[PDB]
Ligand binder design. Structure first.
Ligand SMILES: CNC(=O)c1ccc(Nc2ncc3cc(C(=O)N(C)C)n(C4CCCC4)c3n2)cc1
Length: 262
């Protein structure tokens, strides 16, 4: 069906290792959307051309208000085109840059949305979404959208590289090279809850090497303003042992979440 001729192209919203994301508009409907362009040369060089095919099929069947929708896709001789939902308010990472840190009501509301999205994902055996805030977008209603599909893409305003942000969110079992399961998403939720409340991710260090040690040894501390309920949820999510991490339904029922979420 689709071809590049079906779209008007506007400015690049961001750029990544594999290509760019453009503001775009379907000509007939004048619908605004995000056109993600991946260069086949880059996909081939990295050896991920088979992984892209699988994730396109997965993404084509994920339908949830807090997951960025894939409308369709096509290709030409040099490029793959993903026709994505456009999230008009940008990344949560940028919101965090602007506000420095989130209050407990905003944080608990965002965590609720993500826990619901991740529960849906898990129900389809979809695990390990990279939910660093650079991959979380804000829809027109301010609702969170998981948008890690098709690899990282940064806006010009970003000050954290793809490798650094992804490392900040990696769980000990994947740094220690062990088997992992869907509990990696619970770990990521704890890192995110902390970054939301603090304005910095908990294991940030000068070097990647020190960050590895801090993650593996779960070495993090709380600023004085983090309330006891927030400490309790974050401490349960950032357990080294994945079996000790709560179920997503237990996150949603956590007293700090229910007391503060919209
Ligand atoms: C001052 N305005 C802004 O910074 C702004 C930035 C993006 C949007 N919309 C928007 N909509 C859909 C997307 C899909 C991606 C993407 O492939 N990611 C891996 C996440 N991205 C990225 C592009 C670069 C930042 C997120 C999307 N971005 C609106 C406003």
């Amino acid at each position: 069906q689709w071809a590049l001729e079906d779209f008007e192209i506007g400015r690049p919203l961001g750029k990544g290792k594999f290509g760019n994301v453009y503001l775009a508009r379907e000509k007939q409907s004048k619908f605004i959307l995000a056109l993600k362009v991946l260069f086949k040369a880059q996909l081939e060089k990295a050896g991920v051309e088979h992984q892209l095919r699988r994730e396109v099929e997965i993404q084509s069947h994920l339908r949830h208000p807090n997951i960025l929708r894939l409308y369709g896709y096509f290709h030409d001789a040099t490029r793959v085109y993903l026709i994505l939902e456009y999230a008009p308010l940008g990344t949560v990472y940028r919101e965090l840059q602007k506000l420095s840190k989130f209050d407990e009501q905003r944080t608990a509301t965002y965590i609720t949305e993500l826990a619901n999205a991740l529960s849906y994902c898990h129900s389809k055996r979809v695990i390990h979404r990279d939910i660093k805030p650079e991959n979380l977008l804000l829809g027109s209603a301010g609702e969170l959208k998981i948008a890690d599909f098709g690899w990282s893409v940064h806006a010009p305003s970003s000050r954290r590289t793809t490798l650094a942000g992804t490392l900040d969110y990696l769980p000990p079992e994947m740094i220690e090279g062990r088997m992992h399961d869907e509990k990696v998403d619970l770990w990521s939720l704890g890192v995110l809850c902390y970054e939301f409340l603090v304005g910095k991710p908990p294991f940030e260090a000068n070097t990647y090497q020190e960050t590895y040690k801090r993650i593996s040894r779960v070495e993090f501390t709380f600023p004085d303003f983090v309330t006891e309920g927030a400490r309790d949820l974050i401490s349960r999510l950032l357990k080294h042992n994945p079996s000790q991490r709560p179920m997503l339904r237990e996150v949603l029922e956590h007293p700090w979440i229910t007391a503060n979420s919209s």
